[PDB]
Amino acid sequence: AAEKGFKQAFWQPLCQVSEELDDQPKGALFTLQAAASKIQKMRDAALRASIYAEINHGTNRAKAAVIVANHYAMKADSGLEALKQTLSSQEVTATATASYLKGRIDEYLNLLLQTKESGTSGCMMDTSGTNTVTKAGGTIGGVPCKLQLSPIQPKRPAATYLGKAGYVGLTRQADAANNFHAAAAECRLASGHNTNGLGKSGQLSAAVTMAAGYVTVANSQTAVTVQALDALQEASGAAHQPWIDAWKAKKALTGAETAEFRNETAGIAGKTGVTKLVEEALLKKKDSEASEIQTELKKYFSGHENEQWTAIEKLISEQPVAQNLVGDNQPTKLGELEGNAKLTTILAYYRMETAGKFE
Numbered sequence: 001a002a003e004k005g006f007k008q009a010f011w012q013p014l015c016q017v018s019e020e021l022d023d024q025p026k027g028a029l030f031t032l033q034a035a036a037s038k039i040q041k042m043r044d045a046a047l048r049a050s051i052y053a054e055i056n057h058g059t060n061r062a063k064a065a066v067i068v069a070n071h072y073a074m075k076a077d078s079g080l081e082a083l084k085q086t087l088s089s090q091e092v093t094a095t096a097t098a099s100y101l102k103g104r105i106d107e108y109l110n111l112l113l114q115t116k117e118s119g120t121s122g123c124m125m126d127t128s129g130t131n132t133v134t135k136a137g138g139t140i141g142g143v144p145c146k147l148q149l150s151p152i153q154p155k156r157p158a159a160t161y162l163g164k165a166g167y168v169g170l171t172r173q174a175d176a177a178n179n180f181h182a183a184a185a186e187c188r189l190a191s192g193h194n195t196n197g198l199g200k201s202g203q204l205s206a207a208v209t210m211a212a213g214y215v216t217v218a219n220s221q222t223a224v225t226v227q228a229l230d231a232l233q234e235a236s237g238a239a240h241q242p243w244i245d246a247w248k249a250k251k252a253l254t255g256a257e258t259a260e261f262r263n264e265t266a267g268i269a270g271k272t273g274v275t276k277l278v279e280e281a282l283l284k285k286k287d288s289e290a291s292e293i294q295t296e297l298k299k300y301f302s303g304h305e306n307e308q309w310t311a312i313e314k315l316i317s318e319q320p321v322a323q324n325l326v327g328d329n330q331p332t333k334l335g336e337l338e339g340n341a342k343l344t345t346i347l348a349y350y351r352m353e354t355a356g357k358f359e
């Protein structure tokens with residue numbers, strides 16, 4: 001009945017959204033760390049190839065490794081630029097819009113939870129509208145509903161309650177007086193009229209919206225109405241705008257999975273940086289033919305397909321460095337070394353050796 005406390009079918013879908021929004025900061029931290037990690041892996045491969053070239057310098061194998069080193073250093077460069085230009089804003093915006101909306105929802109739900117007079121009369125009722133619910137740890141009436149922002153650990157969340165189309169559980173409600181409102185539980189947050197609702201001497205001067213514009217509390221003796229939020233469209237200045245902002249920011253997320261962060265399986269000529277380097281440093285002519293690039297490449301890779309690129313990478317990975325450059329009993333093959341700073345100083349050692357050979 002109108003002007004009565006809210007049954008579980010009303011507030012459980014809000015709990016579900018709040019719990020899922022709680023994971024958006026975790027996903028943002030995961031993605032920012034994953035981007036940095038992938039950049040670091042690209043840089044390690046660039047450094048191994050560079051070290052191999054110095055060790056084997058002046059050979060066709062070394063020139064192949066220079067091409068490989070250039071490729072992976074450009075991947076690392078481009079991932080850092082994308083982290084600056086795109087990923088940082090995407091992940092901060094998702095974190096902020098999700099956390100802001102969660103705060104709007106949780107403040108409303110916490111008010112419902114506390115506004116009660118007895119075990120059978122209050123604003124937050126169970127599924128049958130018989131008993132007011134209580135919070136026990138991170139649950140309310142048996143529903144996960146912490147009403148707090150959890151400690152932020154990296155995690156990959158699975159979009160369930162907020163997806164590509166909108167908030168799946170926040171559907172059009174045709175019969176709120178019977179499906180949202182209890183039969184007898186009293187709740188002055190259920191209307192703006194003075195007899196049973198928020199008005200004191202008279203009715204409130206207008207309808208009131210709560211939960212960032214989701215629910216509309218009329219100032220007459222009538223049931224609430226809700227915005228359907230499951231088939232959203234991009235808009236500006238809506239009463240429920242924070243729902244749209246979080247949905248839009250979440251839909252834009254790519255993770256650390258755009259092309260800068262992934263390896264390329266194309267033929268060698270099409271791999272990042274390869275054609276420009278062949279043209280500028282080997283052919284020494286701009287606007288070259290494809291046949292010429294492929295012909296140059298066979299000199300150094302014995303072919304021009306991904307298989308010949310992998311073969312050079314295996315030679316790079318198997319190359320040992322000088323024993324004294326690693327700790328006692330530690331591995332010396334480049335493929336068994338990782339960490340940018342560790343490989344950077346090994347490259348510097350071999351560049352000094354290269355200088356001493358020219359001396």
Ligand SMILES: *[C@@H]1O[C@H](CO)[C@@H](O[C@@H]2O[C@H](CO)[C@@H](O[C@@H]3O[C@H](CO)[C@@H](O)[C@H](O[C@H]4O[C@H](CO)[C@@H](O)[C@H](O)[C@@H]4O)[C@@H]3O)[C@H](O)[C@H]2NC(C)=O)[C@H](O)[C@H]1NC(C)=O
Binds near residue numbers: 046313317334338
């Ligand atoms: C894009 O692709 C490149 C090329 O594949 C890739 O660089 C490669 O990274 C792997 C590591 O993921 C290196 O593979 C090594 O292979 C040897 C021989 O089988 C293994 O022994 C290695 O494992 C030992 O060493 C690891 C440290 O590196 C330890 O963590 C591990 O426990 C083992 O003790 C390892 O599998 C390979 O050498 C490089 N290749 C080159 C040319 O550097 C790069 O990481 C990819 N980029 C992204 C973002 O994924």
